Design an enzyme around this catalytic site. Sequence first.
Site, PDB file in Angstrom:
ATOM      1  N   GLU A 296       0.759  -1.262   0.260  1.00 55.24           N
ATOM      2  CA  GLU A 296       0.152  -0.658   0.074  1.00 55.24           C
ATOM      3  C   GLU A 296       0.282   1.120   0.006  1.00 55.24           C
ATOM      4  OE1 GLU A 296      -1.960   1.191   4.099  1.00 55.24           O
ATOM      5  OE2 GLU A 296      -3.820   1.656   2.092  1.00 55.24           O
TER       6      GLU A 296
ATOM      7  N   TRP B  69      -8.704  -2.078  -0.247  1.00 52.06           N
ATOM      8  CA  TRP B  69      -9.341  -1.182  -1.096  1.00 52.06           C
ATOM      9  C   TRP B  69     -10.439  -1.723  -1.755  1.00 52.06           C
ATOM     10  CZ3 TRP B  69      -9.474   3.619   1.259  1.00 52.06           C
ATOM     11  CH2 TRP B  69      -8.419   3.118   1.299  1.00 52.06           C
TER      12      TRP B  69
ATOM     13  N   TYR C  76      -4.843   9.738  -2.029  1.00 52.50           N
ATOM     14  CA  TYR C  76      -3.660   9.522  -0.991  1.00 52.50           C
ATOM     15  C   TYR C  76      -2.325   9.810  -1.531  1.00 52.50           C
ATOM     16  CZ  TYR C  76      -6.138   7.896   2.935  1.00 52.50           C
ATOM     17  OH  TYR C  76      -7.566   6.897   3.872  1.00 52.50           O
TER      18      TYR C  76
ATOM     19  N   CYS D 161      -7.930   9.426   5.037  1.00 49.37           N
ATOM     20  CA  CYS D 161      -8.688   8.757   7.419  1.00 49.37           C
ATOM     21  C   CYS D 161      -7.425   9.598   7.589  1.00 49.37           C
ATOM     22  CB  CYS D 161      -8.427   7.431   6.970  1.00 49.37           C
ATOM     23  SG  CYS D 161     -10.103   7.102   6.959  1.00 49.37           S
TER      24      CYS D 161
ATOM     25  N   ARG E 242      -7.633  11.050  10.956  1.00 49.52           N
ATOM     26  CA  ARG E 242      -9.366  12.135  11.373  1.00 49.52           C
ATOM     27  C   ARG E 242     -10.653  10.898  12.209  1.00 49.52           C
ATOM     28  NH1 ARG E 242     -12.473   9.922   7.659  1.00 49.52           N
ATOM     29  NH2 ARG E 242     -12.558   9.689   5.935  1.00 49.52           N
TER      30      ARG E 242
ATOM     31  N   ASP F 119     -10.043   3.259  12.658  1.00 51.81           N
ATOM     32  CA  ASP F 119     -10.313   1.982  13.597  1.00 51.81           C
ATOM     33  C   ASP F 119      -9.843   1.382  14.489  1.00 51.81           C
ATOM     34  OD1 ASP F 119     -11.384  -1.243  13.012  1.00 51.81           O
ATOM     35  OD2 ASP F 119     -13.012  -0.799  11.420  1.00 51.81           O
TER      36      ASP F 119
HETATM   37  C1  LIG Z   1      -5.504   0.746   7.360  1.00 48.97           C
HETATM   38  C2  LIG Z   1      -5.384   0.704   6.653  1.00 48.97           C
HETATM   39  C3  LIG Z   1      -5.705  -0.081   5.017  1.00 48.97           C
HETATM   40  N1  LIG Z   1      -6.673  -0.734   4.871  1.00 48.97           N
HETATM   41  C4  LIG Z   1      -7.940  -0.106   3.532  1.00 48.97           C
HETATM   42  C5  LIG Z   1      -9.401   0.273   4.718  1.00 48.97           C
HETATM   43  C6  LIG Z   1      -9.634   1.074   3.732  1.00 48.97           C
HETATM   44  C7  LIG Z   1     -11.784   0.597   4.546  1.00 48.97           C
HETATM   45  C8  LIG Z   1     -12.036   0.810   5.561  1.00 48.97           C
HETATM   46  N2  LIG Z   1     -13.329   0.294   6.387  1.00 48.97           N
HETATM   47  C9  LIG Z   1     -13.099   0.275   7.600  1.00 48.97           C
HETATM   48  N3  LIG Z   1     -14.458   0.790   7.959  1.00 48.97           N
HETATM   49  N4  LIG Z   1     -11.536   0.153   8.732  1.00 48.97           N
HETATM   50  C10 LIG Z   1     -10.922   0.186   8.030  1.00 48.97           C
HETATM   51  O1  LIG Z   1     -10.273  -0.283   8.409  1.00 48.97           O
HETATM   52  C11 LIG Z   1     -10.726   0.186   6.985  1.00 48.97           C
HETATM   53  C12 LIG Z   1      -9.635   0.730   6.406  1.00 48.97           C
HETATM   54  C13 LIG Z   1      -6.889  -1.307   4.566  1.00 48.97           C
HETATM   55  C14 LIG Z   1      -8.116  -2.676   5.124  1.00 48.97           C
HETATM   56  C15 LIG Z   1      -8.608  -3.813   5.314  1.00 48.97           C
HETATM   57  C16 LIG Z   1      -7.677  -4.424   5.837  1.00 48.97           C
HETATM   58  C17 LIG Z   1      -7.820  -5.608   6.251  1.00 48.97           C
HETATM   59  O2  LIG Z   1      -7.158  -6.524   6.977  1.00 48.97           O
HETATM   60  N5  LIG Z   1      -9.172  -6.351   6.449  1.00 48.97           N
HETATM   61  C18 LIG Z   1      -9.141  -7.523   6.351  1.00 48.97           C
HETATM   62  C19 LIG Z   1     -10.980  -8.583   6.918  1.00 48.97           C
HETATM   63  C20 LIG Z   1     -11.165  -7.832   5.610  1.00 48.97           C
HETATM   64  C21 LIG Z   1     -13.485  -8.547   5.758  1.00 48.97           C
HETATM   65  O3  LIG Z   1     -13.485  -9.900   5.689  1.00 48.97           O
HETATM   66  O4  LIG Z   1     -13.776  -7.465   5.735  1.00 48.97           O
HETATM   67  C22 LIG Z   1      -8.959  -8.942   6.270  1.00 48.97           C
HETATM   68  O5  LIG Z   1      -9.081  -9.821   5.612  1.00 48.97           O
HETATM   69  O6  LIG Z   1      -7.373  -7.740   6.309  1.00 48.97           O
HETATM   70  C23 LIG Z   1      -6.357  -3.815   6.283  1.00 48.97           C
HETATM   71  C24 LIG Z   1      -6.447  -2.425   5.762  1.00 48.97           C
HETATM   72  O1  LIG Z   2      -5.923   4.339   6.401  1.00 53.60           O
HETATM   73  C1  LIG Z   2      -7.788   4.317   6.973  1.00 53.60           C
HETATM   74  C2  LIG Z   2      -8.639   3.758   6.586  1.00 53.60           C
HETATM   75  C3  LIG Z   2     -10.392   3.616   6.770  1.00 53.60           C
HETATM   76  N1  LIG Z   2     -10.309   3.542   8.159  1.00 53.60           N
HETATM   77  C4  LIG Z   2     -11.643   3.301   8.465  1.00 53.60           C
HETATM   78  C5  LIG Z   2     -11.449   4.911   9.002  1.00 53.60           C
HETATM   79  C6  LIG Z   2     -12.771   4.530   9.424  1.00 53.60           C
HETATM   80  O2  LIG Z   2     -13.787   3.331  11.220  1.00 53.60           O
HETATM   81  C7  LIG Z   2     -13.469   3.973   8.180  1.00 53.60           C
HETATM   82  C8  LIG Z   2     -13.459   5.086   7.007  1.00 53.60           C
HETATM   83  O3  LIG Z   2     -14.753   5.713   6.978  1.00 53.60           O
HETATM   84  P1  LIG Z   2     -14.958   7.317   6.714  1.00 53.60           P
HETATM   85  O4  LIG Z   2     -14.441   8.116   8.341  1.00 53.60           O
HETATM   86  O5  LIG Z   2     -14.850   7.888   5.782  1.00 53.60           O
HETATM   87  O6  LIG Z   2     -16.647   7.489   7.500  1.00 53.60           O
HETATM   88  O7  LIG Z   2     -12.496   4.143   7.947  1.00 53.60           O
HETATM   89  C9  LIG Z   2      -8.678   3.259   9.215  1.00 53.60           C
HETATM   90  O8  LIG Z   2      -8.933   3.319  10.339  1.00 53.60           O
HETATM   91  N2  LIG Z   2      -7.584   3.801   8.292  1.00 53.60           N
END
Ligand SMILES: C#CCN(Cc1ccc2[nH]c(N)nc(=O)c2c1)c1ccc(C(=O)N[C@@H](CCC(=O)O)C(=O)O)cc1
Ligand SMILES: O=c1ccn([C@H]2C[C@H](O)[C@@H](COP(=O)(O)O)O2)c(=O)[nH]1
Lengths: 510, 491
Positions: free
Chosen positions: B262, B284, B310, B370, B391, B394
Amino acid sequence: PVCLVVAMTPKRGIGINNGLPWPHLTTDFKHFSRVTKTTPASRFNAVVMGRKTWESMPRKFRPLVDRLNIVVSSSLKEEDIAAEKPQAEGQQRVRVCASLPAALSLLEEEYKDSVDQIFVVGGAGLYEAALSLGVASHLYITRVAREFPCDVFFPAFPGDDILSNKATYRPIFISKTFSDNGVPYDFVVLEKRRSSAAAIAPVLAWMDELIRAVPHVHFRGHEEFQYLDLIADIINNGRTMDDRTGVGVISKFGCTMRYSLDQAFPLLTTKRVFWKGVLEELLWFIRGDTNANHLSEKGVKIWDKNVTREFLDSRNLPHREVGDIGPGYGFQWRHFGAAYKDMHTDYTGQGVDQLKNVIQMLRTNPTDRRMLMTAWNPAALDEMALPPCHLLCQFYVNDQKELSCIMYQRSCDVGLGVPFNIASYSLLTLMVAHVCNLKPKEFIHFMGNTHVYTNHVEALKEQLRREPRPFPIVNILNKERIKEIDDFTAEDFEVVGYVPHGRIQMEMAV
Amino acid sequence: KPVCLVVAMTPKRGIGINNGLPWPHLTTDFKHFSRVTKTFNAVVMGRKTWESMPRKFRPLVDRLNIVVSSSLKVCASLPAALSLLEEEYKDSVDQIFVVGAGLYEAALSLGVASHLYITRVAREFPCDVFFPAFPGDDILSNKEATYRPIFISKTFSDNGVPYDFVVLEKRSSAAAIAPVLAWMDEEDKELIRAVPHVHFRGHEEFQYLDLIADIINNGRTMDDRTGVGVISKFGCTMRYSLDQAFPLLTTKRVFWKGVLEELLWFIRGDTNANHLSEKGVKIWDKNVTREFLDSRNLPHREVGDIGPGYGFQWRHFGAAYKDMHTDYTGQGVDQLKNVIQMLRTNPTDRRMLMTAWNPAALDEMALPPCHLLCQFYVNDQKELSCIMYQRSCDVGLGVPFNIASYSLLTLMVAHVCNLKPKEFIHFMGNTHVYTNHVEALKEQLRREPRPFPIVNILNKERIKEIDDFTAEDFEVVGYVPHGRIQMEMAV
Ligand SMILES: C#CCN(Cc1ccc2[nH]c(N)nc(=O)c2c1)c1ccc(C(=O)N[C@@H](CCC(=O)O)C(=O)O)cc1
Ligand SMILES: O=c1ccn([C@H]2C[C@H](O)[C@@H](COP(=O)(O)O)O2)c(=O)[nH]1
Ligand SMILES: NC(=O)C1=CN([C@@H]2O[C@H](COP(=O)(O)OP(=O)(O)OC[C@H]3O[C@@H](n4cnc5c(N)ncnc54)[C@H](OP(=O)(O)O)[C@@H]3O)[C@@H](O)[C@H]2O)C=CC1
Ligand SMILES: NC(=O)C1=CN([C@@H]2O[C@H](COP(=O)(O)OP(=O)(O)OC[C@H]3O[C@@H](n4cnc5c(N)ncnc54)[C@H](OP(=O)(O)O)[C@@H]3O)[C@@H](O)[C@H]2O)C=CC1
Ligand SMILES: C#CCN(Cc1ccc2[nH]c(N)nc(=O)c2c1)c1ccc(C(=O)N[C@@H](CCC(=O)O)C(=O)O)cc1
Ligand SMILES: Nc1nc(=O)c2nc(CNc3ccc(C(=O)N[C@@H](CCC(=O)O)C(=O)O)cc3)cnc2[nH]1
Ligand SMILES: Nc1nc(=O)c2nc(CNc3ccc(C(=O)N[C@@H](CCC(=O)O)C(=O)O)cc3)cnc2[nH]1
Ligand SMILES: O=c1ccn([C@H]2C[C@H](O)[C@@H](COP(=O)(O)O)O2)c(=O)[nH]1
């Protein structure tokens, strides 16, 4: 060995017309009750008071329950008091004595074994005698920050500088600021001075390892201690570095403070902060105004040295008129990304109005996580007289319609700018809370390069010898008239109960 | 009678090979050893262990020494040596420490050891002598009395070897002030806490564990965009040291390949998520499906196009976005380049920032960023620190990933600027735990952290500019996490 308990205006005022000078302070009454009642069993405490203080108390609360009451008087008799109201079972009969020395004799003679602590509870007659005898070890003082009409005063005492600007009594305890009924106040205590996990500590022993604000203060509840400790921390632990200005710097990186906004307002008290300056600058920002002459003309000169012909040229902006900060702060807030011309241009409708967006999101979807405003536009930095220091802020609403705000500041002049920045974004939070029908809860300050200039260190050390005063309250006046963020004027604010120490001169590093 | 064991071991419990130590010299472990063993004290050691010691140290000075051979110039057994400490030395002997195997295993079978002082060597090394298995073993790797950690230090390193120190145990003015504190505390049901048996919590991962606990205990339950619901707080802060080891979380396996890919993807200014997905990094994908893009009012975006987000803003801030197949070379502001140039030429400058937050372009992005700002700082010892502002956090899913990401960026930037990485500082806005993660996180909070690994940059000589890094230029050394925990992404 006795303790005094009092509430007091900054001018030592305690009463008027045989009553209290202020509206009802419920937390102060809780405190009074809690300090005078509590014990480990067998004993009770005694409260000693003057006749008028006894008379000032409402019938239903007198005598004060679960405490031996002694009244000092030569006219009131014990049977007068017994006749006033039937003694309740289990309570102590109310005693009357002719003087404070007599009250303390009686306590020894007839109530050794029976009483634990002795509290002198007013009025000025008793406070004065107790201090004259030198029998008071501690003062429990509730500092009321507003002045009120008073005809009775607590006596002058060595150490009475914890109230206002001019054996000793030094503060060992300073709470955060409370408020009730539009009155700010806090609590201080002065003191008369003149192998469980045993075997773990040698690993701790080898892993383990000067300037401090008012070090005799042991309980540091006042939120201003965050600022005072940050000054000390930088001076003790920071690193001496060069700097854009040529003035030296001692710096640290990544610092944090937070200030409650629900009870009072974090306008620092350990030196006078230029409030007209913060208010006028914030209104100017909100306008999207980039003409610092509009500030200068109102007696707010904070931007003048960075908008001179000379400084503008050092920035390769010969085409800027004197006073033109370029597309900075307020411009980016109200018109992010618009094409700048000069400070005399109408930009209405150009670029992104971030402030409007934040407000609309607060009013309609307060759980949204994108409620941010930024002044950092990399495309426009070179056109600015100064790249912004406070560059981003984010809003948040909880469960109970309470609004909190975080601001990120890349560069923090701890001496000069920081107190001003704290007040500025705390005020913005108040303004936004009001316009969105919210309750202001918290300002959170995130700091990047956090520094004190070398030519401020001496003055800052003097500042660290001052104990903080209770924070003031800021009221928005004319609330009904004010419905949108652009509605606020320089007249819609009232600062109540501000009692800071004197100004400290600190030159701006230019 | 109280006995304690002092040991250093690999995760597979390795302690020696060819009558020597398996690892290169661990300077801080030796200090630790010195201190612990003296505060006189007795150290007790097997025959072979005595030989292994260089003669210049062989009498372990300022402590009584006992060898338990049956062949040398000194008791014949471990029970024997304990008798020899009660009978004589009864006075002027404080605590006793056993310091080889056989001796360790004698002390465990006879059940006389009350505490284990263990230096956890994070890397595996060839060994032919192993510390005995013991209940409490999971403190080393993932493989009735029991040994429970009571102390877990920060991570150290020497000679490219990360390691930790743990301790296991066999299992008037205040009066004046008191009434006032009491009433102020009164107002104001069952708190959770990460591994509450650990008192001395030096491991930096406790910040993350404590953060989870604090949110679940003190956060407020709120709605959110995804519909899932969260418990949230606002304004949280962590910082991770980078000079000894690398904060790749150990209480659950972190997806390192994903972090690295990433980040390189950001650095290229790439906005095509199919390039990530095609490498097996699908992080993503759910936010760039046809359905999600349409929900964002972006029907004209191709699947996988994150828009001008980004990396595009890092490398081309303010440029006009077309699509993910466009070449934006030279367009916009290259903030990353500017940051690096300032770091190399004038590192006392206070404007070394990079932002992803561009209000003019937010609606064109699949997701507003984020992690939206980072700032760099250099001290007077050429040490680099980085602050990132996020901002929206998660906690369960995003945060460990974000921590590794910006810590890695810090290592990369330090290297091309000829600086040394010192610290990553994490500033967090809306910091939240999704309701469907709570149970999983409660399992995680029962896990003791393992020593952090170290990340090395390979081929340093070839790498001169930030664009020169590839996915093959890194090695994670000594990573020993607990198992992955499934946490579903709220879309
Ligand atoms: C930070 C950051 C980059 N991101 C980008 C990204 C995009 C949307 C998000 N959305 C939310 N709600 N929380 C996040 O942390 C998040 C992160 C990440 C996204 C997923 C995984 C991840 O490990 N996902 C799991 C579960 C997938 C599922 O079943 O839902 C996996 O299986 O590995 C890690 C980083
Ligand atoms: O690098 C990242 C990208 C996404 N998220 C999770 C943040 C949130 O719980 C959800 C993003 O949605 P909004 O904040 O845009 O609603 O992003 C992270 O923690 N780290
Ligand atoms: N803000 C606060 O913390 C407090 C405020 N208050 C208030 O303060 C003002 C009332 O206090 P004040 O006016 O001083 O009244 P006092 O409570 O001191 O009563 C006055 C008198 O009390 C007895 N007396 C007091 N001192 C002596 C003495 N030194 N020697 C012999 N007799 C003594 C006397 O009564 P006699 O004439 O019968 O001999 C003297 O006239 C009021 O407003 C009361 O409400 C009171 C307590 C606390
Ligand atoms: N990682 C670490 O913290 C440490 C690692 N090591 C590694 O130790 C290896 C040595 O450990 P190990 O091989 O077990 O060596 P030991 O130190 O245990 O020496 C072995 C022997 O010690 C005396 N002995 C031990 N047990 C008994 C017993 N139960 N009854 C009577 N005598 C006993 C004996 O000598 P005899 O034959 O003369 O009777 C037995 O043969 C090396 O790699 C050493 O460096 C050592 C210390 C610490
Ligand atoms: C932050 C911020 C806004 N600013 C803008 C501003 C502009 C350039 C800066 N430059 C430097 N080096 N430090 C700053 O804090 C700083 C602040 C301020 C500028 C000056 C004063 C100031 O001089 N305060 C004094 C003296 C003047 C007065 O009172 O009229 C005071 O003690 O009140 C306050 C705020
Ligand atoms: N700090 C301080 N505040 C005071 O109000 C105060 N007041 C007096 C004198 N006047 C009064 C008047 C009423 C009550 C009163 O009714 N007290 C109740 C409060 C009960 C509660 O809130 O729990 C009591 O039982 O103490 C006390 C003192 C003396 N020292 C003071 N000291
Ligand atoms: N945790 C741990 N680490 C070890 O290296 C270790 N080593 C042994 C055995 N080997 C050795 C070898 C040398 C020294 C030694 O020279 N000790 C000195 C100097 C320490 C220093 O050099 O700073 C001492 O008195 O501490 C000790 C034990 C036993 N238990 C251990 N336990
Ligand atoms: O709101 C502000 C504006 C300026 N300063 C002081 C920050 C620095 O000490 C000097 C600004 O110059 P540079 O950081 O740009 O060098 O700004 C502040 O503290 N707060």
